[PDB]
Amino acid sequence: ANLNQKKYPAKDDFPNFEGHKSLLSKYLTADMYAKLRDVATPSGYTLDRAIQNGVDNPDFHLGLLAGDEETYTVFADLFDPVIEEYHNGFKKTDNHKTDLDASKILDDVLDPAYVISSRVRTGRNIRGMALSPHVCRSERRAIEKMVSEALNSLAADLKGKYYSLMKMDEKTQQQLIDDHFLFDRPVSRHFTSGGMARDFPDGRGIWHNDKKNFLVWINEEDHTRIISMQMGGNMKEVFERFTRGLTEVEKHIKDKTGKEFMKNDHLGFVLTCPSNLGTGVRCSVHAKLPHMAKDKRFEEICTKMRLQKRGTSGGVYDISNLDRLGSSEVEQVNCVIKGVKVLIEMEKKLEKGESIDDLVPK
Amino acid sequence: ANLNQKKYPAKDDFPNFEGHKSLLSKYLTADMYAKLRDVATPSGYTLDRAIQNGVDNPDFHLGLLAGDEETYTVFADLFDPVIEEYHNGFKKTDNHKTDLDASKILDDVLDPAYVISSRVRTGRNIRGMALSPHVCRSERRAIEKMVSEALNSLAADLKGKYYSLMKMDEKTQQQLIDDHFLFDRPVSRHFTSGGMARDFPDGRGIWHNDKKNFLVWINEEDHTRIISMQMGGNMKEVFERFTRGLTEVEKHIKDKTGKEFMKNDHLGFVLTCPSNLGTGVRCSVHAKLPHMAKDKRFEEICTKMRLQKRGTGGVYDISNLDRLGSSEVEQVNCVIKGVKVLIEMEKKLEKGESIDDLVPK
Ligand SMILES: Nc1ncnc2c1ncn2[C@@H]1O[C@H](COP(=O)(O)OP(=O)(O)NP(=O)(O)O)[C@@H](O)[C@H]1O
């Protein structure tokens, strides 16, 4: 931290939130700031570094980025009310539940005629080590180290290859971009003022299995970004490979280094940006619902089935789980499955020209 | 600082300088990095913070930024050798000399047909406050306050007002930049890898007299950037107005807050980027030299007359190469003298005449 800072009145350090449209600006008052300005985490992460994201960008919705797990407890006065509003009422007294049991997932195969692709993405961080806003070079290398080794120990259908973003050649860069596996130069301001673009690309890397349905990004926003994806609508299979890979990797790391995933009872998995807390899961499917798009209640139909839609490229929508924190991976995934099946059924009624007032919420 | 960093062996924290072309990758050895990785300045600035600019950008030539004044001494092991190669053999034993004497400036008026505008700028930092890569908001506002007030005390032709970058709209700002008065908005990799773009635009602004031949940038790369500029080639006059506002702005700050500019005997004025030590002066003109641009000797000839050229119509910015080890009067005079030869050569080439005998030897 800057040691001259504390000789000054907090008042003089308090951000001007004029024009800002973030939850940071809405909940951090002058008195709350005067209270935590000189209070840092055990690893040395400050309040300023924590809010740098939003002070620098007034239109970012949250404008908050944690540098370690203790950031959520040391700066609870700011994080809790922000987590509560974003996560639709999740309180500081509420506790998150994890349920990564693949056998609990519905075996309903969504209509291949309406569903193009199925996807499951989550993020994981390593316990006891600084997140990206704050991570040093040695910690980052060590993460890359224990994670790539665990991915490289994967076998059978999880068997694959690791790629260091460092000194990568154009041939390999072109390949990964053609597959949509590659992530590069963190030029975006979310990363730059977030302190996450440091030392790039030292410590960064990507990994994908030979069958190309299991993808892992290394040391981007979170220590690991895990994605499982394939064509069609067999979400259940997508989630079962997703869960198997996660289990085998944590187990390799846990036994070879002694460490596991950043995780606690109140928040579930700890992620850098609080918008991905709890499950950090994004279960999505590309569905073809053109007649739904013209229907006005499409938005509300989804919100009540706890889902969000996103247009993508005619009439193709990305339908994902609305919840992250407060409900489980199992519930969020079966939420998408049941929801999409209901969406396909209403879609067929509109194709025929029938009414679906018999299916929508009251 | 990351308190968990000292727990790891220094080698695992040591930068992979593979492919870097900077002075940082050339002088920061593994053993040096090991000895200075956990040594922080009195204000808390770290070695990592200081070298971030070059670690992130291997194309950069220097790679290091100072967080405060103690940075230059606490990390002298890195900065001295770097300062020495960059500033042509300037050792830590050598000492910088100041000379802001306006009466000693060459009174030649550069041909206005070729010299569009003349400019003189320098950087000043207030002692006791962190520099831009480390400065917090309260310090930045305090600086913004003590400088803007020192400037509104100026009278007559130096008389002007302060414009906060928070108060001015995008169109006034784009205008000021296209017209060469206001600084670029900090989105270059240099500003973002060094921690200098934090809280922007809180604490920054541009102050200028109603005339606009005298202005100063507040809290960009350096606490202040004092500028003197006008149309034409009367450099001695640009410099005169420059040393006046400079003197007066410094008297006011002292009288009102008792603060002064960072300056020691070895380095002269202390600036954030070590490329700007000594005088912190960039004496420049925007000259019309389309015939010189076609000559492959252009660069060699500039370098010879100790000048740097950076283009964009054959329009070039011609400034002094040297900063540290020689004075303000010497640098400005070096530019007046050199741009003069450049103008003469240009008049030859226009006539299809020789300039071979004009080439410095
Ligand atoms: N002789 C000149 N006449 C008019 N404008 C100039 C002159 N020299 C530089 N400028 C303008 O000043 C602005 C800043 O120039 P820049 O290249 O940043 O030089 P500087 O102010 O010394 N900063 P730096 O980039 O650190 O060297 C630009 O918009 C230029 O158009």
Ligand SMILES: NC(=[NH2+])NCCC[C@H](N)C(=O)O
């Ligand atoms: N103030 C400046 N931009 N000086 C020029 C060199 C800066 C550049 N970031 C480097 O370290 O190479």
